């Protein structure tokens, strides 16, 4: 077993935007993960090591104790529905928003709405909290294409600038919630390794404010 902390990160956006906070906490990465097939890396701190995951895996790894803590989007946390982690900090990075989107200028069909989305639980919960009755299909990516080819009336997807919506002939409709990356911690790790965490958490706490 590993005595120190195992931080779970996703490659790309999450890795890049966290580097500032990790630096201030004295946990810089030794090598570039993109120049390697390794998925586990050491850091400047010999107690911390980083895992490179897909963003959807981060809560799962942290939940079951494979990582002591990690950085996951609130959208992923909402969809995952993980009541088995501690969500300690809003890091205010990777900011975007979950929302609905249909075809540009199209009217809503007067029947049960078909929602194409990766975020299945969120979609149902959202539309149920409105007046709306829906059917949902699970898809994994490239959501903006689904209404163009008849696979759904609306979508539920993250949007920041809107460039992807507009580039695929869509426009946003409703706002579901704001989304930013959170620092999540394994419940047992928060109890057992608090001494290792508390300095690193307070560095993040400073880095934000």
Partner 1 sequence: MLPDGVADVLFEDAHKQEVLRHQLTQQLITHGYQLVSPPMIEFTESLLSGASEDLKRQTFKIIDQLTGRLMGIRADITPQILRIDAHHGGDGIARYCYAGDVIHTLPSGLFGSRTPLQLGAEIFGCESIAADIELIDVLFSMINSLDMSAVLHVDLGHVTIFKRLAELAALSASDTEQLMQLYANKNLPELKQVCQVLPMGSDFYTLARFGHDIANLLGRLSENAQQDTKIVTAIDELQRLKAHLQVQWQCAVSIDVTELSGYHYHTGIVFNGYINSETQPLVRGGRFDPRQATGFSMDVSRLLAHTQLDAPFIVLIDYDAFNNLDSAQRQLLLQQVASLRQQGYRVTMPLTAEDMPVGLTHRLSLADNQWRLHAV
Ligand X SMILES: Nc1ncnc2c1ncn2[C@@H]1O[C@H](COP(=O)(O)OP(=O)(O)OP(=O)(O)O)[C@@H](O)[C@H]1O
3-state secondary structure the chain: CCCCEEEEEECCHHHHHHHHHHHHCCCCECCCHHHCCCCEEEECCCCEEEEEECCCCHHHHHHCCCCCEEEEEHHHHHHHCCCCEEEEEECCCCCEEEEEEEECCCCCCCCCEEEEECCHHHHHHHHHHCCCCEEEEECCCCHHHCCCCCCCCEEEEEECCCHHHHHCCEEEEEEEEEECEEEEEEHHHHHHCHHHHHHHHHHHHHHHC
Binding of ligand X by 141 (CB under 6 A): yes
Residue 10, contacted partner among ligand X, partner 1, ligand PRP, none, CB below 5-8 A by kind: ligand X
The answer to whether 145 contacts partner 1 (rule: CB under 8 A) is no
Q: Does 155 bind a second copy (CB under 8 A)?
A: no
Binding of partner 1 by 28 (CB under 8 A) = no
How far apart CA 93 and CA 10 sit, in angstroms, is 13
140 is a contact residue toward partner 1 (CB under 8 A)? no
Q: Is the dihedral of CA 146, 148, 154, 156 positive or negative?
A: positive
Query: Is the Cβ of residue 77 or residue 197 nearer to ligand PRP in the bound state?
Result: 77
Interacting residue ranges for ligand PRP, rule: CB under 6 A: 37, 141, 144, 157-164
Dist. CA 38–CA 27, nearest whole Å: 18
Which of 15-23, 87-95, 123-131, 134-142 is the region at the interface with a second copy (rule: CB under 8 A)? Answer: 134-142
Structure tokens at 54: 């897909």
Q: How far is the CB of 151 from a second copy (least distance, A)?
A: 5
CB of 110 to partner 1, least distance (A): 8
List of residues contacting ligand X (CB under 6 A): 10, 12-14, 54-56, 73, 75-76, 94-96, 141, 158, 160, 179, 181
List of residues contacting partner 1 (CB under 8 A): 1, 63-65, 83-90, 110-112, 114, 124, 127-128, 131-137, 150, 185-192, 194, 205
List of residues contacting a second copy (CB under 8 A): 6, 36-40, 51-54, 56-57, 60-61, 64-67, 137, 139-142, 144-146, 148-151, 163-164, 167-168
């Amino acid at each position: 077993e590993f005595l120190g902390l195992t931080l779970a990160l996703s490659k790309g956006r999450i890795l890049e935007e966290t580097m500032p906070l990790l630096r201030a906490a004295g946990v810089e990465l030794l090598e570039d993960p993109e120049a390697s097939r390794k998925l586990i890396f050491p850091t400047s701190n010999p107690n911390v090591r980083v895992l490179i995951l897909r963003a959807s895996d981060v809560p799962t790894y942290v939940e079951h104790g494979a990582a002591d803590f990690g950085v996951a989007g609130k959208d992923v946390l909402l969809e995952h529905g993980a009541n088995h982690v501690y969500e300690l900090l809003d890091l205010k990075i990777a900011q975007c928003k979950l929302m609905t989107a249909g075809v540009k200028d199209a009217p809503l069909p007067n029947r049960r709405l078909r929602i194409a989305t990766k975020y299945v639980n969120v979609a149902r919960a959202y539309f149920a909290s409105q007046g709306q009755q829906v059917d949902v299909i699970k898809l994994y990516g490239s959501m903006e294409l689904a209404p163009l080819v008849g696979l759904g009336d609306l979508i539920v997807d993250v949007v920041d600038t809107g460039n992807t919506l507009r580039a695929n002939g869509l426009e946003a409709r409703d706002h579901i919630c704001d989304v930013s990356s959170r620092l999540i911690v394994n419940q047992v790790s928060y109890k057992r390794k608090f001494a290792l965490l508390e300095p690193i958490l307070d560095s993040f706490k400073n880095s934000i404010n």
